Amino acid sequence: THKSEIAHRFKDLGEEHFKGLVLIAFSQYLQQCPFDEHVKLVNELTEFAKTCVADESHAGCEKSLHTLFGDELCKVASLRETYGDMADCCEKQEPERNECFLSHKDDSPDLPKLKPDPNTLCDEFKADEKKFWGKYLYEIARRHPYFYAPELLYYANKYNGVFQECCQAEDKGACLLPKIETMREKVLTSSARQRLRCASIQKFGERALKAWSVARLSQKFPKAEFVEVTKLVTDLTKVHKECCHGDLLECADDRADLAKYICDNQDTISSKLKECCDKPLLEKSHCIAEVEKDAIPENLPPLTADFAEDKDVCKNYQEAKDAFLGSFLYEYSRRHPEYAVSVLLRLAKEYEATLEECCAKDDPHACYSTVFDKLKHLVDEPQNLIKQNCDQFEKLGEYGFQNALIVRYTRKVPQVSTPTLVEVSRSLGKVGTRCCTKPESERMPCTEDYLSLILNRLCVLHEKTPVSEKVTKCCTESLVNRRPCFSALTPDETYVPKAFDEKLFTFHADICTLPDTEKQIKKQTALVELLKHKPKATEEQLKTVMENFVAFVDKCCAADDKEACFAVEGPKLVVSTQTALA
Ligand SMILES: O=C(O)c1cc(I)cc(I)c1O
Ligand SMILES: O=C(O)c1cc(I)cc(I)c1O
Ligand SMILES: O=C(O)c1cc(I)cc(I)c1O
Ligand SMILES: O=C(O)c1cc(I)cc(I)c1O
Ligand SMILES: [Ca+2]
Ligand SMILES: [Ca+2]
Ligand SMILES: [Ca+2]
Ligand SMILES: [Ca+2]
What does CATH list as the number for 107-195?
1.10.246.10
DSSP symbol at 79: H
Residues 6+ apart with CB under 8 A from 372: 303, 304, 307, 308
Nearest to 426 by CA among 396, 402, 454, 450: 402
CATH code 1.10.10.10 for 1-106: no
Q: Classify each residue of 86-96 as buried b or exposed e, where b means 16 or more C-beta atoms within 10 Å of its C-beta.
A: bbebbeeeeee
- The domain spans of the chain are 1-106, 107-195, 203-294, 295-380, 381-492, 493-570
Determine the Cα–Cα distance for residues 9 and 2; give it in Å rounded to an integer.
10
Report d(CA 333, CA 345) in Å as an integer: 9
CA distance 498 to 181: 38
CB neighbour burial string for 129-163, b if at least 16 within 10 angstroms, e if fewer: eeebbbbbbbebbbbbbbbbbbbbbbbbbbbbebb
Task: Name the method of structure determination.
Answer: X-ray
Same fold, 1-106 and 381-492: yes
Sort 13 into a burial class: Cβ within 10 Å, 0-12 / 13-18 / 19+.
Answer: buried
Fold of 493-570: Serum Albumin; Chain A, Domain 1 (1.10.246)
* CB distance 376 to ligand 1 below 6 Å: no
Q: Which helix (H) or strand (E) holds 241?
A: helix 226-244
Distance separating alpha carbons of residues 410 and 422, to the nearest angstrom = 9
Q: In whole angstroms, how far apart are CA 490 and each of 104, 390, 485, 541? A: 34, 21, 10, 20
Range 203-294 classified under CATH 1.10.3720.10: no
Contact between 405 and 428 under an 8 Å Cβ cutoff? The reply is yes
283 is in an annotated binding site: no
User: What phi and psi, each to the nearest 5 degrees, are found at residue 379?
Assistant: -95, -35
Q: What are the start-end ranges of the E strands in 271-350? A: none
Q: CA 442 from chain center: how many Å?
A: 19
CB 268 within 8 A of CB 256: no
From the CA of 32, the nearest ligand is 5
Nearest one of 346, 377, 342, 337 to 452, comparing CA atoms: 342
- Fold assignment, 295-380: Serum Albumin; Chain A, Domain 1 (1.10.246)
Q: Report which protein residue has its CA nearest ligand 4's atom 12.
A: 193
Quote the CA–CA distance of 403 and 131 in Å, as a whole number: 42
CA 453 to ligand 4: nearest atom: 10
352-383 b/e (C-beta count within 10 Å ≥ 16 → b): eebbeebbeeeebbebbbebbeebeebbeebe
Topology at the third CATH level for domain 381-492: Serum Albumin; Chain A, Domain 1 (1.10.246)
308 and 372 Cβ atoms separated by less than 8 Å: yes
Q: What residues does ligand 2 touch, defined as CB less than 6 Å away?
A: 217, 236, 255, 258-259, 285, 288-289
Distance from residue 216's CA to the centre of ligand 4 (Å):
8
CB burial class (10 A; 0-12, 13-18, 19+) of residue 192? buried
Closest of 523, 528, 526, 521 to residue 502, by C-alpha: 526
